Amino acid sequence: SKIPIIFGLINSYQIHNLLEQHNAKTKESKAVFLIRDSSTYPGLLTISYYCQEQDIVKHIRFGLTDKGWKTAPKPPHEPLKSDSPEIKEKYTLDKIKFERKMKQFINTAKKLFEQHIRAESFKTLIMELKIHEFNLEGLIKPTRSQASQEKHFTDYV
């Protein structure tokens, strides 16, 4: 009857309110966090938390590698209509780099995500959370109706 610790596809309003309900804004950054299915890249996990320094919710994507869960490539900063030609020229190169790196990353991650759950992938998720200095006691756990239904997470309990 155990519920996975991974959220399913939840919306941005719900993410903010879950963090606020668990008092993320009166605790250090990463003291409170949640883990959810990525809404952009199936097979990836996204860690959402509150960044005290910027007063915003931030997100970090993880995917399976041969070594276990690792951080995915991160995208360059979004275009701003105030951008100069220099910013936009750099963005072109950085976006191509991101897309190439993310395409390779997802192709490997999806294959591993699809493969049989010998379950020892779960330990590597905890390791990467520790390396990122997420307070594991601050993990927000989903309710049954909000938990991920991905078969890979059935024993992520």
Side-chain angles (χ1 to χ4, degrees), residues 11-59:
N11 66 64
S12 179
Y13 192 73
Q14 183 175 14
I15 293 161
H16 171 272
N17 289 331
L18 282 162
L19 292 169
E20 214 162 78
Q21 147 175 52
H22 292 268
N23 302 107
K25 299 195 183 181
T26 58
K27 301 169 169 161
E28 292 180 343
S29 302
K30 297 180 181 172
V32 171
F33 69 98
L34 58 83
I35 313 164
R36 56 191 179 84
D37 288 324
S38 172
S39 76
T40 300
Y41 302 104
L44 269 38
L45 289 173
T46 297
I47 313 310
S48 297
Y49 70 99
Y50 180 69
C51 171
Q52 281 283 0
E53 271 287 89
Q54 298 183 235
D55 187 35
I56 61 159
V57 174
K58 285 196 144 173
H59 311 280

